[model samples]
Target: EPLHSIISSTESVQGSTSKHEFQAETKKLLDIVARSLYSEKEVFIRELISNASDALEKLRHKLVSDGQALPEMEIHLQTNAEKGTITIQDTGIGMTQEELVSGVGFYSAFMVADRVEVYSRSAAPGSLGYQWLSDGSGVFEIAEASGVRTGTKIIIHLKSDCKEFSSEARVRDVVTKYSNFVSFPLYLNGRRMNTLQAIWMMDPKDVREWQHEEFYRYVAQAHDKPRYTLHYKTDAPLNIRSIFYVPDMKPSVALYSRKVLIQTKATDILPKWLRFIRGVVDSEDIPSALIRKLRDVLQQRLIKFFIDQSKKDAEKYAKFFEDYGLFMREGIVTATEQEVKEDIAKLLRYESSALPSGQLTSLSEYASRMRARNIYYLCAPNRHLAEHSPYYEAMKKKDTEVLFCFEQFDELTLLHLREFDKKKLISVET
Candidate 1:
């Protein structure tokens, strides 16, 4: 027997090696799959869980699309580290034997685990369950399962090094990292790990404040409720579903592909300056291409949102800028491309001598208010000192208004921003 075919326990029923083959090449292809398909075999759990969710969603589709009854059940994961076995069970639209023969080696589980057994019964009336067993070999058995239930259960005899799947802690961490925002409830060792739904995909009328509070705590990984929540959905540009929260303290992006989680944080989706924003994204396509386009769209969208807020109620946004102001400036500073720098520039805000201390405006606003169109700014410890400085005097004598940057790194932000809107973003001394 091969090392993968080590039938590890007695409770499992193992037939002779006379079982049939689904659709696999040979052990040759299997070896390469272990090395390439997944950099981390542990993520196999994510795929399996995703498929399990898909199964549940399919069953729910019958209820949703056909107005049928919804099953009251959860995705259950049972792990026995000592036995080196992990079983994922779901009471959904269970597969028929025909569904099981669709092809085995999608690298869903075979790469990480050795022996795989799928016991499935259909959801239709008077359906019988069957077990399809394989060990990455070219053969599988379709034996009648005894005392089976009306759903699907996948029992995997894990590899030695992959024993982590048999651990509750390990499985729970992966579940939260990847599927924390999945639509259904996921339980590990009889405890419900996912207590909330992907409210981003849900309608706002169906959601409540406390629900946002709970979901925020889950994604933000903290206790404090969000100070502001942006629950947005649109049909254009690839059916985007998303939610973002401005936390009371400080924070992050959760990225998803068609309800399947890709990672914990999607830094590519947002510039570093908006790092304080935390939430999730659901898309119908791949992220690599959409991430760039969405980056440009979201940067402008969010900056426009925050900028409008700044104008409507100065104190509301002033409180936010008090904590995260430098970050926006950083986006302007670090961006290499000119359009990126200037697009980020519209988000930068500062105080003017013509306005109250907390009152603010951006580079475009300052330039729009001036005739020379030459960017002018003065860095000072206080507004009084800024107004009294010799550099301030020259610009003041020139009748050109200067923006006051009382915050640290504000000067460096402009130095790197270099210029904004085709006008030079030079200091007053320049």
Candidate 2:
């Protein structure tokens, strides 16, 4: 009854032991894996907390889906720089001996600690407590739970060189960097670590505009409020939950699979073109492959957003265009795909001769009044110079008007686009 049951007799019993080796397929690769098992040591902390949180989320799901009640789901961690020990504990549907033996994340601690001991009692009432202990090499031992409760606790006896894990400051920084959005309240010693909620997971209606501003400042580390808040959730392509603000971004990260956080972002999902857009795409599902698809979805949405906004708020958009249009122009110039170039070109604006001075017209609007397929544009220092320039000499003969471009970037944009709306955007120079 070593692990099959908790005994009324026995001080420290050990049994049901089996040991195995990490597969060293070849010296060429196995050595590399053994050597490169971890890029950074602190990642081991994140991995441990992630597993604990995952178990807790599953425990929550099981209660609703299967109607099985268990302990209140939570995760707790402790560090002692003095004792050279760090312990991570969780109240969740605990793992079976088989799951504990086969898991990968648990093994991560071996890289940084001298010995890692897992003590767990299954959440099922009166279930036996079990222990799985390992030392980073391939071999591991399974035994009776060592004085435990209805949860899992991992005690890492830190290596002399690895004593840094015992530092509260170091441990805190790692949690903040990687697991800040973890669904459960994470405690380092006794203090709560993650205070921000994963607002990306909430219904858009439930999130107030003012709240968005605050979260934006929090995650974005910005002093100003966001110009726009794009909170999106989707299940079609991939389960995606994200909040993008035009700084103007914040990270209510807690990226999850089902409900556990997965280190969503320090702001990496958005494309370079949309770097001005700051936000995080977090998911605990789809093996986190959803992040790439997350980028695709946002790109399409932003493309349509620019198209719709251009027509909806001409005056409001002109200021953004005047200040940040160069980015769109740069996007058009650098983009390899013709379709991408066209989509961003839709946001471009130019002064038109037919319209009053300082008035802007789009290629579509200019093309609608086209006398010919070729859209004419003149580039000069100012409208006055463009109107009187030799570049406009021939267009006057045909009684046709030309768009006036004021910046050198306009010349670059025209050269890159060459055509839009079935009309050529040629600088008189071209």
What tens digits encode model 2's per-residue C-alpha lDDT throughout 342-380? 877877888987898988987877887876578778778
Q: Pick by TM-score: which candidate is best? A: 2
Candidate 1 clashes between residue pairs 3 or more apart in a chain or in different chains = 252-277
Best candidate according to lDDT: 1
Alpha-carbon TM-score of each model against the true structure = 0.78, 0.81
TM-score of 2: 0.81
Deviation from native of the Cα of residue 271 in model 2, angstroms: 4.4
* Alpha carbon lDDT at 319, candidate 1: 75
Error of 1 at 272 (Å): 2.8
Per-residue lDDT tens digits for candidate 1, residues 366-403, read 87787856777878999989988988887665777888
- Models, CA RMSD each: 6.0, 5.9
Q: Each model's number of backbone clashes?
A: 1, 7
